A paper describes a structure:
The cytochrome bc 1 complex, also known as respiratory complex III (CIII), in the electron-transfer chain of the inner mitochondrial membrane is a homodimer (CIII2) of two biochemically identical protomers. CIII2 catalyses the transfer of electrons from the lipophilic two-electron donor ubiquinol (QH2) to the water-soluble, one-electron acceptor protein cytochrome c, contributing to an electrochemical proton gradient across the membrane. Electron transfer within the complex occurs through the prosthetic groups of the three catalytic core subunits: heme b L and heme b H of cytochrome b (cyt b), heme c 1 of cytochrome c 1 (cyt c 1) and the [2Fe–2S] cluster of the iron–sulfur protein (ISP), often called the Rieske protein after its discoverer. The Rieske domain is tethered to the complex by one transmembrane helix and a connecting flexible linker that acts as a hinge.
(iv) +FCN: oxidized with potassium ferricyanide. Alternatively, the Fe–S cluster is positioned closer to cyt c 1 (the c or distal position). In the c position of partially reduced CIII2 (apo) His190 was within 3.8 Å of the propionic acid group, whereas it did not approach heme c 1 closer than ∼8 Å in the fully oxidized complex (+FCN).
Residue numbers in the entry:
A (entry chain B): 15 to 416
B (entry chain E): 39 to 99
C (entry chain A): 26 to 248, 260 to 474
D (entry chain R), E (entry chain G): 2 to 125
F (entry chain C): 1 to 55
G (entry chain N): 111 to 383
Amino acid sequence: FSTAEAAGVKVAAQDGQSPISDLSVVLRGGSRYATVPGVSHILEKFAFQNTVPKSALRFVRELELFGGKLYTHTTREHIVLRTQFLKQDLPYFVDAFANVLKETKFQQFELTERVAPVAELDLLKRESDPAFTALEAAHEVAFRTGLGNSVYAQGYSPVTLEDVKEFARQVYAKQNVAVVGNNVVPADLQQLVGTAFADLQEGSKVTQAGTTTLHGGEARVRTSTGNALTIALPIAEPKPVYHALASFLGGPASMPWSVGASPLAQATVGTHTSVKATYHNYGDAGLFAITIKGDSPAEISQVAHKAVQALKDTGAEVTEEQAARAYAKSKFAAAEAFENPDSSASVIGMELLSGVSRIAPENVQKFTPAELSEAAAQLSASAKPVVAAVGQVHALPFADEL
Amino acid sequence: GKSTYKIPDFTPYLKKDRNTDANRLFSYFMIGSFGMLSAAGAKATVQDFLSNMSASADVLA
Amino acid sequence: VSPKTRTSNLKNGLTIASESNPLVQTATVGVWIDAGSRNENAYNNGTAHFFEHLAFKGTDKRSQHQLELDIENMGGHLNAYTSRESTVYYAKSFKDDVPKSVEILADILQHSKLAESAIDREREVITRELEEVNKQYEEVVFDHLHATAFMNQPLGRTILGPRENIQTITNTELRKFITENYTADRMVLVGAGAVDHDALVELAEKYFSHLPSSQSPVPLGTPIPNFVGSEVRLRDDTMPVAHIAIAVEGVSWTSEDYYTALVAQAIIGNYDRAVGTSRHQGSRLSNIVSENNLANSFQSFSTSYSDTGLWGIYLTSENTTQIDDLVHFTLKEWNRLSTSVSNLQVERAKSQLKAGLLLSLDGTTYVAEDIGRQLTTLGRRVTPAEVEAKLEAVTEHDVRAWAQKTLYDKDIALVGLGPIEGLYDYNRIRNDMSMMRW
Amino acid sequence: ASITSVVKTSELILKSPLLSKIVVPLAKTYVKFSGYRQLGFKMNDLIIEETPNMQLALRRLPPTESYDRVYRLIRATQFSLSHKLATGNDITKPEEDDHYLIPYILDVEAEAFEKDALDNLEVV
Amino acid sequence: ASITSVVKTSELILKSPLLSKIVVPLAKTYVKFSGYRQLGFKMNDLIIEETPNMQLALRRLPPTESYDRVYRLIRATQFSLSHKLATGNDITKPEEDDHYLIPYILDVEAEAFEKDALDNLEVV
Amino acid sequence: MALRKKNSLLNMANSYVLDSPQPSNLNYFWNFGSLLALCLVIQLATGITLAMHYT
Amino acid sequence: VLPWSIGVIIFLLLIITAFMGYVLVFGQMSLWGATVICNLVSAIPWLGEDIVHFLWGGFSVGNPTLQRFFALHYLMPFVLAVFALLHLIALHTAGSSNPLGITSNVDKLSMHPYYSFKDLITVFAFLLMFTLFVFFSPDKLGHPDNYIPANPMVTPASIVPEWYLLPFYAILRAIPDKLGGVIAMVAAILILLILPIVDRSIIRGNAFKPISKLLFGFFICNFLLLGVLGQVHIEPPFIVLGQICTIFYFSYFLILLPMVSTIENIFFYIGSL
Ligand code: HEM
Ligand code: HEM
Ligand SMILES: CCCCCCCCCCCCO[C@@H]1O[C@H](CO)[C@@H](O[C@H]2O[C@H](CO)[C@@H](O)[C@H](O)[C@H]2O)[C@H](O)[C@H]1O
Ligand SMILES: CCCCCCCCCCCCO[C@@H]1O[C@H](CO)[C@@H](O[C@H]2O[C@H](CO)[C@@H](O)[C@H](O)[C@H]2O)[C@H](O)[C@H]1O
């Protein structure tokens, strides 16, 4: 991805040999920057609504003629708007993004009838998985605000048209916008962005209201639709070793009809439960989480104990074999993330919008058994453990039990 | 008895040539014949019945 | 313009096919086999799926545990799936972990233990799978759809097989199945992503050279199905969403109407209330359904097999008093493929498909799946230029002629699951397959 | 006729100096003799509403405008059945006769008409 | 007639040795000639249900009993329209002809009749 | 919605002669109702015609 | 639109009912009115004469015609009652309109007791008018010639329909061609079916439309003048006047209402800006 600048907008493109191009606008407008709860989700859903030059209806009918597709999502850091089309149709897509950022008519009926109902279905689909809920709850406990804001719009706190219009006034500005073009000729994209995004406001960098503060605690989301448990450990100094530790501890199987050779995978033997360790770097803080879902609260409780033990055991000693297995699983995870268009866009988006240089999968550091065990030791000896239980919460573990 | 993927036995009723044009055409011949006799019967009925309104034999005399 | 698919053969008749992409760092290698559940009879139905479980249960060298460790140490993963006509076993890895992954795949296919102890253990796991598919409503609907459309025929059988067979499958019949079916002339070794073709051919010569050849080598994707107009109703008043599939007999992979059926399918298209753009789609059915809240979703499909296919639509709806309208309007849109479609809809669908067929291939696993599917169904990878030409050859006259012989006034296979009291009987549904005004 | 039609034709007239010079005074007298202001109505209260497009435009009115319209209709119905006219503050003054509904119906119709056009597009 | 009535009279007969000696054999032949078992029905499936009391009793059936009743009614309807009789396990055997509904309807009616009585109480 | 359901007049006919839900097991003795309707139609047609010629 | 369209058929049935009932007296006007009105069917091309003889049941109006008119006159009121019920059921979906032309969904009253008791006033006013004619002037609305028995030989001085059919008779006379005149006369009733289309107003009804109210006044008075011209002799200058009034009648539907309703739309919009 050759990083450049076109009319004040950071543009990164990588040419390829495929008939398919992906163009993504990455906006610094994720939920950590959200003025009011849920506004970044609503703004994401308000992309490709009526603009002054082109109605939502006309856009969709013309997109069907190009056979293009549209993908949008919100993270804690970004809003990502991606289009996938044939290479030759690049100018149309650039101009479409320009219309969205410059000329969206944010109309009250779109919010009531189109945008908010779709945002609500989006969230309900995600929450069907109790593990999603548990990991969301864990961020809320760990960070409270900023990273602790909900990503998604909720019913209890309604977003108004004035909320969304104000946020868009901040976000849709040259200072908060990065363009990422996969299989796009880099010189051609710079020329097009340079003409189309010239009259976009300059604006100012959106910032998190307040510094990131870490907290421990418990969340007990009582649902009737499945059971899950997250054990998170907030990290004050995000370090790349936690990727290796996440992949080492593992949890999912690398093979059909198997349990797996990872410590966390082996904690689920004899139970219909699954586990996944994940590490979330947010630049200024991190979260190391272990999420366990299952149908039995008794089995979840059983696995949860084994999971925290596994982490303690790792803090004791890692073998050389296990450290190499961690390097391999971690390099692979890095590679596939840079391939997947959704995650790819945000990776270069972070490089462009912040200044965090991307770590190429081929440059992923190999951590010795000493470095891995040291990282696990810090986590086992955390002052601020977070536990989010979802489901039959009376039957799930508590932080002080773990 | 228990599995719902084991279709009950329909072999006593199934025709082997069920997807053929000849198969459909036969049933439409029966439907068509019935429509044809209904049309010819309606026409005869209407014509004979409505003729009551034409000049009666005593008037034509 | 994508890089050329290179293809080589071995002496036994194993095909090697590759598409390199120097922009990615991962690679998907695997074995596509032209064999699946359809190759079983009634007594060993379930064997192919049973084997898939045992393939990962240990080989003559590596035990179950060693197998797990070896893959964990590679860094990527292995995956497998068995369908009616196709079995796949693949490995996604790093660029330079490809020789390891080819070696593991060659081992689990050729040299699997199939130990009585493991057969007995999986026999319970698979028995539990029988009572948990019940939740995957789309799969329940499609399995009943095949069972009824191809009543008492091999394509009508499920992949899991009956409970009875699961309890009686022996290592003997497992071994017999994979010896008869997993032959070199039925197999394709595929690599996509960061693979060198010449390197992959060498790995094939090293690991897959002692594969049996079949006695009578037919070409790849070589097959008589007699479709039954019929219905299965699985009424369940406690479910909130109705799931309905309606299909007619469709087209095989090598039909001359293959592209015509895809265009017709694209004219109806898909719809999902949860997606923001779906209320603005051009499809008439989409507009009717969204304006009247008739459905949560619908998905047109055109499934092909070697010698038949199913063409139809899958609908989901919570609108339980207007299922009649949903089915009525759907079938009246199908009628219009016979009576009313013109260059307006046909050229719009062609535009959408020319991109769609290329867009689908957006990662190494998708590319490998495309090379493998095309090689095992058509015997070759069809270039995008050829595909663009075949789509361009579809006219409105072709669509009308196809719909008049395939849809118009034809029997349907119909499956309803859930609160389907409002779904009318077979005759009233089938009467919507024609229009009295035409 | 569509509100779109009426609004476009009106704009052609209002552009032409000659046309506006002769039409605007007539239109003002017409409105005075029409007498809907003497029942406390605003012009837009009179537009036929039993149409999909109009039902959608009315649903998009802000709640305040919608509550006030309901009251004007009820009040006018009471004047009609009593054979009385509005007096005092119930009479709509020319400055209060605002086109509160026109922008909503124009947006509804814009989409409806674009949908009709796009349903007839021909790939070239 | 109410189920309560039928049940009470039946109990008077079953008490009397003489009466039961002559009535029980008649009742058993009656049931054999009635032929409802040959359509796979249980006796209680035949009771008229289009009354408030019976609708309430049916709503109080345990879910399994209720699902099984629905199947027996559907199956009997299919035998009726086909002009066939049940064969094999579809025939109701005398031991399967259980009074699954009688306790529910007797409770519903007990309350309904007590309500009628108490609506006519006279403070003494 | 289908016109036969949406339009109030069509819907009344629809409710009695088309979508009307019937038991699936009516026997031939349920056919006398429509025969009586047929007799009534024949009597109206023949009776009105006789009235044109009768004194 | 549906209750209105069924209403137009009710009006055609009422005309036929009343025409056949008038023949039943078999006085001079009965016979000669039947003759001239039934002969209009002879204008139907090719089969017209055959249809007339079929309607009459013979070669002129006579006993067969009278007996069939009695049977149909008895029947037609029942058909009329069914269509009257149909137009009310059709109306019930929208409810009654009201004099302001706006929705009444905001403010409804039960039909009873309010409109029951308001209907009694006009019932008693009607019964007073009924009483004055039936008891004090029972023959004011009739023709003396209908008290002379039908005589196929003697032709009455002037053969006119009953007063309520006179406007349609004037329209027929206006067109010189036989078939032309019949078409015009039927078109004069069927053209009511196009009012839903030719009225281009964005507002329902005339309460607030001064120009439409003037046009409606002229339309109604023209319809009354056509009535009067239906019973004058075919003499100057009533021949030309009948033609001018007929043009005015049709031009209301085809030209004036579409133009006036278009212009009023623009005046409402500009006038209230
Ligand atoms: C339920 C409907 C009807 C029934 C059961 C019925 C019954 C009868 C009977 C039994 C007769 C004696 C027939 C004879 O022996 O000659 C008759 C005669 C007659 N009916 Fe009806 N009728 C009905 C409807 C009508 C209607 C609607 C008319 C319309 C006028 C009518 C007109 C006549 C006439 C004119 C005669 C005498 C001529 C004759 O005997 O044929 N009927 N009717
Ligand atoms: C036997 C003749 C008729 C009867 C008994 C009849 C009866 C009625 C009644 C009771 C109503 C509701 C109350 C009212 O508004 O007055 C009504 C409304 C109506 N009728 Fe008639 N009617 C007849 C003939 C006609 C004719 C000939 C037409 C049209 C040419 C017609 C068109 C209508 C319309 C459009 C309405 C709705 C009016 C509204 O409330 O805004 N009717 N009719
Ligand atoms: C909307 C429907 C269209 C209009 C309906 C037509 C109404 C009347 C037209 C024909 C009626 C008279 O038409 C005439 O019918 C009678 C039968 O009824 C026929 O007469 C024929 O059969 C009758 C008895 O069945 C014999 O007495 C006669 O000798 C023989 O010729 C004539 O050959 C035919 O010319
Ligand atoms: C028999 C000849 C055919 C002509 C029809 C007979 C005329 C009688 C019809 C008028 C009587 C009113 O008839 C009444 O109509 C409504 C809708 O039409 C029916 O209503 C029924 O159907 C509609 C949809 O089909 C549903 O909204 C409703 O839940 C259901 O109850 C009533 O069950 C019926 O009683």
